[PDB]
Design a protein around this ligand. Structure first.
Ligand SMILES: CCCCCCCC/C=C\CCCCCCCC(=O)O[C@H](COC(=O)CCCCCCCCCCCCCCC)COP(=O)(O)O
Ligand SMILES: CCCCCCCC/C=C\CCCCCCCC(=O)O[C@H](COC(=O)CCCCCCCCCCCCCCC)COP(=O)(O)O
Ligand SMILES: CCCCCCCC/C=C\CCCCCCCC(=O)O[C@H](COC(=O)CCCCCCCCCCCCCCC)COP(=O)(O)O
Ligand SMILES: CCCCCCCC/C=C\CCCCCCCC(=O)O[C@H](COC(=O)CCCCCCCCCCCCCCC)COP(=O)(O)O
Ligand SMILES: [K+]
Ligand SMILES: [K+]
Ligand SMILES: [K+]
Ligand SMILES: [K+]
Lengths: 276, 276
């Protein structure tokens, strides 16, 4: 408790170095794709203006602006969207309120109005503590159930005499393998089958959603197709349990980082001490 | 610790009721705006096809699809974007990596490639514990500095004799007022002046960003204008300190919810006991 001011500066420098490395890698990987996309869109527009004589550049840019505002407003520009197929229905509003309290915030659906934004601010402010409580309760229940399960597994295991060492390592590898299998390996398959995504896109969606980053480029609910009535409830249940499992996994990764930090500190101190 | 299975069910029912209420309110507020937007875009397209004879509906829908894919790819359709003005530069990649580790995830900038997505998954998985450590350290430092400040304020206050009661209430109101003034009241003014947003949009942006929901509809960095060189670093510093202040405020709101829960439980038990 009460981390010293010297440790905070070192952690800050480590974080800034991590950001510099991530920025370099992202910049190196992502510039060519954006260059090709820019040439593709410019060539598409010049092709359209070449093919159609009547159109002129000012009107075409005005139409492109209208389309961009249409996407900003949340309405689909392409096709004739039916009035009955409202995107703000109770199932979608339920999904939106769940993302707000969860703090995933995909962003495909946004308020866009003064009253929606005010109610979003008050609703989020009240909502986050309540979900934090629910998540802590679900995490504790999951932890006790898994702990009793591996307690009886270990108890049965005592028939074949085994060293006390590596029993925790094996229990942890079993936890990681079962958790990834049940949370990332299977929902990725269901999402891929019901939506046409690729395996990497499905894994990326599961990781971004459960980690609560929620970029919004890949959203399970939002597509120009019709799903089953119970698809969204099942997705929310997978999200609720996955959030607990990922929070636990992140805590374990943090614990590993601390040990590596303590080990590095003692090793550096020992090398300093003999070095003289 | 180890929340009972009965409490978890009650918290789950409360959360589901909260989502039903939020969904109803959001649906009631947001349907008309979407209806008007849908009519506006349909009327704009039929007006364009009426004004231009040469254009036909299949080609116009194809052009709208090309524009929609251009927005999905992250490139601006409207205007001629210069090749030099890359959106994936080190300043932007730094902003993106900061949102990934922070878990705000605005979503304006996304990987879009197999290597970007794989590196995003590994980078986030390592990054979140490190930021959690940095955030805890900054929160502890802020708490100790504020605690010593109000310690000396209280010590000076003892000249005028005051009741021991309400001293904590006054310190907490002072903390809330100073924190909102310095974190939400002023950055909203700077964002509004440098970007043209309204006051409600600025307050909404600050709340969504610091709460880590990060919808992405309002992003300080992304606009079709040029800012000062140091604008993004100052924004990141405001985000780093704001995250600690909001985490503290959310913890206080959670503590208030717990007390109201304990008070409600004892009041219901007492009413049950006498009721007979
Ligand atoms: C993080 C918190 C975890 C919570 C996860 C559990 C989810 C709780 C459950 C249920 C439903 C919540 C809102 C449903 C309101 C439906 C009202 C309705 O009319 O359905 C319409 C939706 O359209 C549909 O009918 C089909 C699509 C969604 C399903 C409709 C209602 C749910 C029925 C089946 C699934 C619920 C539970 C299944 C359990 C596996 C909305 O249009 P409108 O109202 O304007 O007419
Ligand atoms: C490229 C260079 C990477 C080599 C890395 C690391 C040495 C770690 C220096 C951080 C100094 C703080 C020591 C520490 O224990 O950090 C603990 C956790 O801080 C961290 O984030 C550890 C990061 C280690 C990264 C390993 C690579 C805080 O615990 P406490 O304050 O109670 O002791
Ligand atoms: C949550 C963590 C909190 C961290 C907050 C502190 C931020 C740490 C600081 C600094 C800069 C990090 C990346 C900058 C790399 C700039 C390289 C560069 O050339 O600048 C170009 C950006 O364009 C510009 O020159 C102007 C726009 C951004 C500023 C450029 C560099 C920073 C100079 C001033 C501000 C830094 C610190 C000011 C302190 C108030 C990138 O284009 P390219 O590389 O392809 O040629
Ligand atoms: C509309 C009806 C709203 C009236 C509300 C609420 C009574 C609260 C029922 C929840 C039963 C759990 C009691 C409780 O203490 O919850 C505590 C926190 O749970 C909560 O989220 C409190 C929610 C109260 C909402 C107040 C409205 C958990 O602490 P612990 O397990 O250590 O005792
Ligand atoms: K988020
Ligand atoms: K987000
Ligand atoms: K988050
Ligand atoms: K987002």
């Amino acid at each position: 408790t009460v981390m010293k001011w010297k440790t905070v500066l070192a952690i800050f420098l480590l974080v800034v170095l991590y950001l510099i490395i991530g920025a370099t890698v992202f910049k190196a990987l992502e510039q060519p794709e954006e260059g090709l996309q820019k040439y593709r869109i410019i060539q598409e527009k010049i092709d359209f203006l070449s093919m159609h004589t009547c159109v002129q550049t000012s009107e075409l840019e005005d139409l492109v602006k209208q389309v961009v505002l249409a996407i900003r407003a949340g309405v689909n520009p392409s096709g004739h969207p039916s009035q009955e197929s409202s995107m703000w229905d109770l199932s979608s509003s339920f999904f939106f309120a769940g993302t707000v309290i969860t703090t995933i915030g995909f962003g495909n659906v946004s308020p866009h109005t003064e009253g929606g934004r005010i109610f979003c601010i008050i609703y989020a402010l009240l909502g986050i503590p309540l979900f934090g409580f629910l998540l802590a309760g679900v995490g504790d229940q999951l932890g006790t159930i898994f702990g009793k399960g591996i307690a009886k597994v270990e108890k049965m295991f005592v028939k074949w005499n085994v060293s006390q060492t590596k029993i925790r390592v094996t229990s942890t590898v079993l936890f990681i393998l079962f958790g990834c299998l049940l949370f990332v390996a299977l929902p990725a398959l269901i999402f891929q089958h019901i939506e046409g995504w690729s395996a990497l896109e499905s894994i990326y969606f599961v990781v971004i959603t459960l980690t609560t980053i929620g970029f919004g480029d890949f959203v399970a609910g939002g597509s120009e197709i019709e799903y089953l009535d119970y698809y969204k409830p099942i997705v929310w249940f997978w999200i609720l349990v996955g959030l607990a499992y990922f929070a636990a996994v992140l805590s374990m990764i943090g614990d590993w980082l601390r040990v590596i930090s303590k080990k590095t500190k003692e090793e550096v101190g020992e090398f300093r001490a003999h070095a003289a």
